[PDB]
Amino acid sequence: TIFAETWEASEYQYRNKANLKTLPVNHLGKLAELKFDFVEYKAHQLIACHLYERMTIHCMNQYGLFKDFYRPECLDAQYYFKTCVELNAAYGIQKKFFPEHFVGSPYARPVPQFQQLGL
Amino acid sequence: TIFAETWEASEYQYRNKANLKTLPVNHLGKLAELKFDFVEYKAHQLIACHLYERMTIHCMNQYGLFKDFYRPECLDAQYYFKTCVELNAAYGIQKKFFPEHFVGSPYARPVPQFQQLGL
Amino acid sequence: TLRAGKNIEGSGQVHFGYHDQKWGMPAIPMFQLMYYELPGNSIVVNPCRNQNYRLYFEMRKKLGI
Amino acid sequence: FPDRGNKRRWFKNLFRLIKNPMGYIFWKTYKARLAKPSLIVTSMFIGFTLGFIKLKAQSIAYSKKQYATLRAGKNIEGSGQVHFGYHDQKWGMPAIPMFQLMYYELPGNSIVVNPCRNQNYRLYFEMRKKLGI
Amino acid sequence: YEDFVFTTPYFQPESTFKSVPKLFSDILLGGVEWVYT
Amino acid sequence: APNPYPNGIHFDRVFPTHYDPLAETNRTKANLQLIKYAPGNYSTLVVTSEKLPRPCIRTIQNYRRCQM
Amino acid sequence: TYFYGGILEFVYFDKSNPDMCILVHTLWIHLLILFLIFTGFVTILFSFYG
Amino acid sequence: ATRWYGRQPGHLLRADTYWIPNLVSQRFAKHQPAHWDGTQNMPIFRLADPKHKDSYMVQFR
Amino acid sequence: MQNTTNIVHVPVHMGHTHYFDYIDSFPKLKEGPTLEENHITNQKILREQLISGQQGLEQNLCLRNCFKLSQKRYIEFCLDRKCGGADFQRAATILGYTK
Numbered sequence: 001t002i003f004a005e006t007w008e009a010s011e012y013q014y015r016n017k018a019n020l021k022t023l024p025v026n027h028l029g030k031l032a033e034l035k036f037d038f039v040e041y042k043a044h045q046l047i048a049c050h051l052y053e054r055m056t057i058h059c060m061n062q063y064g065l066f067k068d069f070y071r072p073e074c075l076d077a078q079y080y081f082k083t084c085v086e087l088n089a090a091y092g093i094q095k096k097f098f099p100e101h102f103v104g105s106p107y108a109r110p111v112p113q114f115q116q117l118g119l
Numbered sequence: 120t121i122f123a124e125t126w127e128a129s130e131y132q133y134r135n136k137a138n139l140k141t142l143p144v145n146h147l148g149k150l151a152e153l154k155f156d157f158v159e160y161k162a163h164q165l166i167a168c169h170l171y172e173r174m175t176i177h178c179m180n181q182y183g184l185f186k187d188f189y190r191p192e193c194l195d196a197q198y199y200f201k202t203c204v205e206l207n208a209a210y211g212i213q214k215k216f217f218p219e220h221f222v223g224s225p226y227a228r229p230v231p232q233f234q235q236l237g238l
Numbered sequence: 239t240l241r242a243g244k245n246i247e248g249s250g251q252v253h254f255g256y257h258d259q260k261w262g263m264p265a266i267p268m269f270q271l272m273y274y275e276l277p278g279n280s281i282v283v284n285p286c287r288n289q290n291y292r293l294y295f296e297m298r299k300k301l302g303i
Numbered sequence: 304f305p306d307r308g309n310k311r312r313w314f315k316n317l318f319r320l321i322k323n324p325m326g327y328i329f330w331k332t333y334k335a336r337l338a339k340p341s342l343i344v345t346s347m348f349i350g351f352t353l354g355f356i357k358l359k360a361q362s363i364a365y366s367k368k369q370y371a372t373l374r375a376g377k378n379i380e381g382s383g384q385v386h387f388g389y390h391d392q393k394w395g396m397p398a399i400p401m402f403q404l405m406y407y408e409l410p411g412n413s414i415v416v417n418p419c420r421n422q423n424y425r426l427y428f429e430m431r432k433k434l435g436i
Numbered sequence: 437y438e439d440f441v442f443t444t445p446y447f448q449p450e451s452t453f454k455s456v457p458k459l460f461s462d463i464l465l466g467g468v469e470w471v472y473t
Numbered sequence: 474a475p476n477p478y479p480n481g482i483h484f485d486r487v488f489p490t491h492y493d494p495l496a497e498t499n500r501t502k503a504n505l506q507l508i509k510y511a512p513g514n515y516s517t518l519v520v521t522s523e524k525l526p527r528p529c530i531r532t533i534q535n536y537r538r539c540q541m
Numbered sequence: 542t543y544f545y546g547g548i549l550e551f552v553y554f555d556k557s558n559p560d561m562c563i564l565v566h567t568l569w570i571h572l573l574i575l576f577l578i579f580t581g582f583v584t585i586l587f588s589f590y591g
Numbered sequence: 592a593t594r595w596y597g598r599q600p601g602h603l604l605r606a607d608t609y610w611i612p613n614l615v616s617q618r619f620a621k622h623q624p625a626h627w628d629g630t631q632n633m634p635i636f637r638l639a640d641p642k643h644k645d646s647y648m649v650q651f652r
Numbered sequence: 653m654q655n656t657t658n659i660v661h662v663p664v665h666m667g668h669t670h671y672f673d674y675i676d677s678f679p680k681l682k683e684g685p686t687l688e689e690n691h692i693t694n695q696k697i698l699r700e701q702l703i704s705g706q707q708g709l710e711q712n713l714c715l716r717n718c719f720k721l722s723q724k725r726y727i728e729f730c731l732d733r734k735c736g737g738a739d740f741q742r743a744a745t746i747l748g749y750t751k
């Protein structure tokens with residue numbers, strides 16, 4: 001689990017495997033696509049996957065779930081939220097049980113003890 | 120060291136490296152290119168690198184080392200003999216201290232003990 | 239092969255390094271009589287699959303059909 | 304009978320082309336060169352033709368890079384630098400002024416030995432004085 | 437445990453509170469190769 | 474189809490484009506001479522497992538059975 | 542090797558020792574080839590004798 | 592090991608008439624003496640690395 | 653390393669033919685009985701099994717289906733609930749799982 005609003009992008013990249021995905025910050029540009037009026041505090045936009053969640057609620061309040069919520073600005077927020085929490089759950093588990101896979105871990109490429117050098 | 124006349128080619132091929140050389144048997148065809156008469160017993164032609172040695176001797180007896188030994192049938196025998204013992208010396212050392220590199224060795228891909236499977 | 243987990247540098251099958259190449263069949267009768275391209279429609283499911291229908295005939299008689 | 308006068312005509316033209324290729328080309332293209340295209344078209348033929356040769360020269364240099372890479376211990380499946388997989392490509396400088404002003408190819412003659420090498424000659428001047436030269 | 441044996445060496449709980457300072461390390465997707473033309 | 478989840482992984486062709494998936498709302502189409510995007514426009518990270526051969530499974534079932 | 546060397550790796554020792562010969566006449570031939578190329582550029586586009 | 596040695600950047604001359612900004616700027620540049628500090632790697636020129644701030648215009652292929 | 657590299661554990665003999673590369677024979681290959689012979693051989697086993705091996709079968713199938721469970725505590729429950737209070741070791745001997 002991430003106990004902050006920011007995380008080093010490299011700490012979630014693989015060292016001995018091809019990097020085909022990143023763990024980006026929340027896309028703030030999607031917040032300006034909502035045509036309706038809403039109140040959002042800047043203190044909630046950086047934490048992972050939450051901004052997409054609040055936007056989904058705003059869109060589910062202004063519109064519903066039938067024939068009005070089905071507009072591109074609102075469906076992408078629902079998809080980003082459903083997708084953000086799935087990747088973060090997988091990266092979090094991979095960080096818990098496979099920390100040696102990521103850059104920055106000392107077990108990705110273990111540094112030997114001095115007794116292993118034969119001097 | 121090889122204590123026989125015949126060896127399995129696969130036993131001298133690498134398992135985890137590209138195979139760019141083989142350890143071939145003596146080239147008996149080169150023995151028919153000597154124009155002069157000579158006595159050779161079939162019991163000495165299979166042992167590694169010895170045929171090229173006897174041919175070199177036969178050529179160094181009929182001819183000498185100056186202006187008459189310099190013919191293709193005699194120089195190829197000297198080059199083969201010198202190269203055969205160098206390759207066999209390196210392969211023999213590699214077989215002595217790096218047997219895990221070759222096919223057929225049980226340490227090239229070790230089979231685990233049943234205690235390591237968790238059953 | 240890429241989806242299976244093997245990244246690919248370069249392209250094609252003209253292997254620059256230590257690999258066997260397989261050029262296209264020479265379009266001359268000599269090679270057209272010895273070789274022929276693999277017809278995918280000839281790779282089939284083993285007919286032993288049809289022997290599983292024996293279970294159906296037995297269940298039908300067990301249920302009195 | 305066939306036309307025996309046309310025998311060995313392809314060879315005879317080859318020997319004239321080798322003897323004087325510019326004269327053989329000049330007279331064989333006189334009637335075609337009576338109609339002269341504009342300066343723009345002539346410049347495009349030359350530019351595209353040379354630009355094609357320039358890329359061919361780079362492709363040869365890259366083939367030598369792959370041979371050195373091969374000898375260094377990396378086997379190579381396929382060939383070329385148009386990576387089908389998950390790699391970055393570099394297509395070659397587009398032969399238009401926009402990229403020709405921002406980019407220029409690496410001149411190997413600009414990679415030099417550090418001039419600090421010349422400071423080892425100080426040892427020689429000091430030795431010559433020590434030996435009384 | 438439940439009619440199953442999972443052999444493992446003696447666990448050392450002291451490894452939990454092991455001092456592991458995080459060191460900087462950046463990965464650059466897009467960098468330099470070995471040889472260039 | 475929704476815009477793919479932002480992914481900074483990309484592959485350059487002619488010049489470094491410095492692709493930023495957070496700079497635009499919708500992802501522009503990939504041009505051959507500009508950029509290639511990462512695979513799996515709509516993909517997630519999961520964990521899978523290869524299924525051992527049937528004959529190998531039967532030997533394990535026989536060992537456990539003969540064990541209890 | 543134990544103190545100041547690396548791993549003992551097996552390699553194939555190439556006995557052929559290539560070396561590009563640095564010659565004088567090779568550049569003379571090169572100039573002649575380009576001299577023919579430049580003359581054709583002049584013969585086709587900068588020839589006003591006809 | 593071969594890759595690591597290959598990243599130690601080589602020395603590339605500053606003199607450049609192929610990039611028109613340097614063709615102009617280097618006419619007003621003052622060549623000052625580079626006093627030897629006792630090393631053999633003094634980077635008194637630019638470096639042959641694609642990521643160098645004075646060589647990024649050079650195409651390394 | 654060569655892409656078309658395979659390690660084989662049993663002997664094989666390759667054909668020394670021009671333009672072709674394949675395995676023409678296996679050393680010491682014995683030809684078993686024909687499909688028609690194994691068929692007749694099996695019909696005799698299925699016939700005796702059809703006439704003399706059908707009495708007391710419903711009980712053995714319950715024991716076999718019980719022993720295909722994951723845990724032993726469920727097998728015992730399967731035997732006591734479905735097999736009329738059968739014993740673990742007594743049924744394992746009937747099925748042939750005991751040494």
Ligand SMILES: CCCCCCCCCCCCCCCCCC(=O)OC[C@H](COP(=O)([O-])OCC(O)COP(=O)([O-])OC[C@@H](COC(=O)CCCCCCCCCCCCCCCCC)OC(=O)CCCCCCCCCCCCCCCCC)OC(=O)CCCCCCCCCCCCCCCCC
Nearest residue numbers: 305306307308309310311312313314315316317318320321
């Ligand atoms: C037991 C021991 C001994 C066993 C021996 C066994 C072998 C027997 C040997 C005898 C074989 C010949 C049999 C007798 C032939 C009698 C027929 C006849 O009367 O003459 C017809 C023929 C008619 O020619 P023609 O009427 O004067 O005019 C030709 C046409 O007008 C055309 O003029 P054109 O200007 O329009 O040019 C077109 C030309 C073709 O022009 C071309 O463009 C081809 C150019 C090929 C050369 C380039 C190759 C590419 C690589 C090299 C690059 C060079 C670069 C040069 C430039 C610099 C770079 C820019 O057309 C031809 O190809 C003519 C060939 C003859 C026609 C037959 C049909 C051929 C079709 C398929 C041809 C495929 C091969 C072509 C090779 C041609 C070689 C000349 O004359 C001859 O062929 C004379 C041959 C004399 C040979 C003497 C040999 C004596 C025996 C010694 C042999 C020792 C060999 C040892 C070998 C050991 C094992 C390896």
Ligand SMILES: CCCCCCCCCCCCCCCCCC(=O)OC[C@H](COP(=O)([O-])OCC(O)COP(=O)([O-])OC[C@@H](COC(=O)CCCCCCCCCCCCCCCCC)OC(=O)CCCCCCCCCCCCCCCCC)OC(=O)CCCCCCCCCCCCCCCCC
Nearest residue numbers: 317318319320321322323324328332566567570573574577
């Ligand atoms: C589709 C295109 C595909 C591309 C194909 C490319 C084909 C290969 C071409 C490569 C080009 C090489 C460049 C050579 C530089 C020559 C400079 C020059 O000014 O030449 C005049 C020169 C004549 O001036 P000359 O020296 O006073 O000789 C007159 C004497 O009367 C001669 O005494 P003579 O009349 O009593 O003898 C009979 C006459 C007729 O003789 C023959 O034609 C039969 C002999 C042909 C043998 C096959 C030749 C194979 C290629 C050449 C040999 C290997 C490389 C030689 C290296 C040459 C460069 C130094 O001899 C000659 O015509 C001249 C002798 C030919 C050379 C033979 C000796 C070769 C060894 C010389 C070694 C000296 C250099 C030292 C080694 C350097 C190495 C670092 O011509 C030559 O000597 C040969 C030039 C051949 C060039 C062929 C170009 C064909 C067309 C290319 C495509 C361009 C198309 C453009 C279309 C544009 C449309 C708008």
Ligand SMILES: CCCCCCCCCCCCCCCCCC(=O)OC[C@H](COP(=O)([O-])OCC(O)COP(=O)([O-])OC[C@@H](COC(=O)CCCCCCCCCCCCCCCCC)OC(=O)CCCCCCCCCCCCCCCCC)OC(=O)CCCCCCCCCCCCCCCCC
Nearest residue numbers: 335336338339340344347348351352355577578581582585
């Ligand atoms: C190639 C075809 C497909 C292949 C199958 C071939 C089938 C067998 C046939 C093979 C032979 C085909 C012959 C083609 C050549 C033309 C034949 C001909 O002569 O007809 C009469 C023709 C007279 O032209 P005209 O149409 O009656 O009217 C002309 C009027 O002035 C004004 O007339 P206009 O106002 O009505 O129109 C203006 C202009 C029309 O404007 C243009 O032509 C546009 C030109 C733009 C530049 C294009 C550059 C060509 C591409 C080079 C790139 C390298 C190739 C690979 C990279 C490209 C990848 C696609 O006129 C022309 O240029 C006439 C030529 C147009 C048709 C041919 C153009 C071919 C373009 C390339 C085709 C694609 C290449 C595929 C190659 C694939 C290789 C794997 O002869 C000429 O004199 C013009 C030829 C062009 C040369 C211009 C002057 C060049 C001066 C350079 C001197 C450098 C000296 C170097 C000396 C070296 C040392 C020795």
Ligand SMILES: CCCCCCCCCCCCCCCCCC(=O)OC[C@H](COP(=O)([O-])OCC(O)COP(=O)([O-])OC[C@@H](COC(=O)CCCCCCCCCCCCCCCCC)OC(=O)CCCCCCCCCCCCCCCCC)OC(=O)CCCCCCCCCCCCCCCCC
Nearest residue numbers: 339340341342343344345346349400401404585586587611
């Ligand atoms: C007091 C008055 C001022 C005194 C003026 C004195 C002038 C003396 C003239 C002396 C003539 C020299 C005699 C020998 C010439 C032989 C060489 C030749 O090129 O003849 C071509 C010859 C005659 O061409 P043509 O087909 O009759 O067409 C001529 C005209 O275009 C007519 O045909 P058109 O009506 O259909 O053309 C319409 C025109 C329509 O054009 C327009 O309407 C407007 C054009 C505006 C252009 C906008 C420029 C934008 C630039 C943007 C730059 C961005 C990047 C910059 C990056 C810089 C770094 C930051 O568009 C064009 O096609 C123009 C042709 C290309 C001209 C290129 C040079 C333009 C600059 C002119 C500088 C002089 C300015 C004088 C001030 C005049 C003020 C009124 O044709 C041939 O193909 C045979 C020779 C081919 C050889 C090719 C090799 C070329 C390179 C070597 C040549 C020899 C050395 C260099 C000589 C200089 C050449 C540029």
